[PDB]
Design a binder for this molecule. Structure first.
Ligand SMILES: Nc1ncnc2c1ncn2[C@@H]1O[C@H](COP(=O)(O)OP(=O)(O)O)[C@@H](O)[C@H]1O
Ligand SMILES: Nc1ncnc2c1ncn2[C@@H]1O[C@H](COP(=O)(O)OP(=O)(O)O)[C@@H](O)[C@H]1O
Ligand SMILES: [Mg+2]
Ligand SMILES: [Mg+2]
Lengths: 226, 227
């Protein structure tokens, strides 16, 4: 196989998707073939599509998914509102397994935090990471409360021997300020900060996003991912 | 000894202080002697004082502080900014142990979430709960992300064998709405919801705060906390 990376986060809306796109772009620019799998998409009525965002910002074509729920809720509540079950655990695991190949960086996005229900019954992105032997990139804020949430998310990963690939700060404010700076220094002491995406980067055009993305990660750490 | 509860949260500003004041009020109204305890307090340059809010809202007089910092930051950062160290682990334990008394319920409020550093080095409210053999009451939101943060907090408690005494929704809107209704329903499938304090409980005067508090918790649960 190749390298599988779940991109989780301390919660909903911390920037997992733009981080997938940003790492996908950096990898592709280093000559690494990239796949992204978002098994369950929600909020489709209002037009949410995290896979399309990655395809537009990073140019990935291998973009796999299984389920789309109209309501902008967590997967399990959106499926309960729609009256239709989430996908099954095997379905997601096999989909990621079949995307995987040597020379390929395969990224996997769930929804919200590490423990939100992703399949029936009650199976999480952690269970998926364990099943496909993926390591975990953890996207965090630099804002109030981030150390507590980052530490809780790391404990849950380590509890099932899901390896921490590093942290990414999903949105790095400009100018930093005293809180963001202070918080970044402290996260830097509990795990490697692989990147800090500048605030608003999800709305750049693909040229700027690629340039921004290649400056955001360390060229050698990306190269060695596969 | 008596009963020691740590009152933690899924994060900062979820209402741990108002829950302390509310559980204190309800326990007092059951005739239970209450002490409340706040080892680390930040933001004194802004007038933040959680022990004082608990005293104001619930009439508690047995209020024990220890470390105080001017800046409203994480304790580590606030103490750094003030050129001080966090207290040691044994000083937080001494503060709590000195308060413990048979027939007494001693509430210990941390700062922010469960794994926030409260004592050098990297010592948390969970470590402190272990040292004093306290259960943990988890204050949560009914907002976006609560399930994940609550499940992560509950799992970290069980990982150190710290018993969980339940959830309190620190701020509960009237009327709930679809999001808060959905979350309270889901939180209650994973633990006991001991209370859901009506939003704005901190603006109730002494008399109404005590009525709210007596109705917010199940008296039989409150009374069964303390032998
Ligand atoms: N646990 C959850 N509870 C409620 N809504 C959620 C949850 N997880 C995802 N969502 C919905 O999915 C949208 C995108 O979330 P997510 O992809 O996790 O953000 P990001 O990719 O920026 O980290 C959110 O705006 C929200 O509408
Ligand atoms: N980890 C932290 N990071 C930043 N600020 C904190 C932290 N912990 C406590 N504070 C400060 O203490 C104040 C109240 O926090 P807390 O007592 O945890 O809230 P509540 O009692 O409402 O749950 C906040 O306004 C914040 O400034
Ligand atoms: Mg996303
Ligand atoms: Mg407080």
């Amino acid at each position: 196989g190749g390298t599988i990376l779940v991109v989780t986060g301390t919660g909903t809306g911390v920037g997992k998707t733009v981080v997938c796109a940003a790492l996908a772009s950096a990898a592709r620019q280093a000559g690494i073939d990239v796949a992204v799998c978002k098994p369950v998409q929600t909020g489709t009525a209002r037009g949410d599509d995290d896979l399309a965002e990655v395809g537009r910002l990073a140019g990935v074509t291998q973009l796999a998914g299984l389920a789309r729920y109209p309501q902008p809720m967590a997967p399990a509540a959106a499926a309960e509102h729609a009256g239709m079950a989430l996908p099954a655990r095997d379905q997601i695991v096999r989909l990621i397994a079949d995307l995987d190949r040597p020379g390929r960086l395969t990224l996997v996005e769930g929804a919200g935090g590490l423990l939100v229900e992703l399949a029936e019954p009650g199976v999480t992105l952690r269970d998926v990471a364990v099943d496909v032997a993926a390591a975990a990139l953890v996207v965090v804020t630099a804002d109030l409360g981030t150390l507590n949430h980052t530490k809780l998310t790391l404990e849950a990963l380590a509890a099932q021997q899901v390896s921490c690939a590093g942290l990414v700060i999903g949105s790095w404010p400009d100018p930093p300020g005293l809180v963001a700076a202070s918080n970044r220094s402290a996260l830097a002491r509990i795990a490697m900060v692989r990147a800090a995406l500048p605030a608003g980067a999800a709305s750049l055009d693909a040229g700027d996003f690629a340039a921004m993305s290649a400056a955001a990660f360390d060229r050698n750490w990306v190269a060695g991912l596969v």
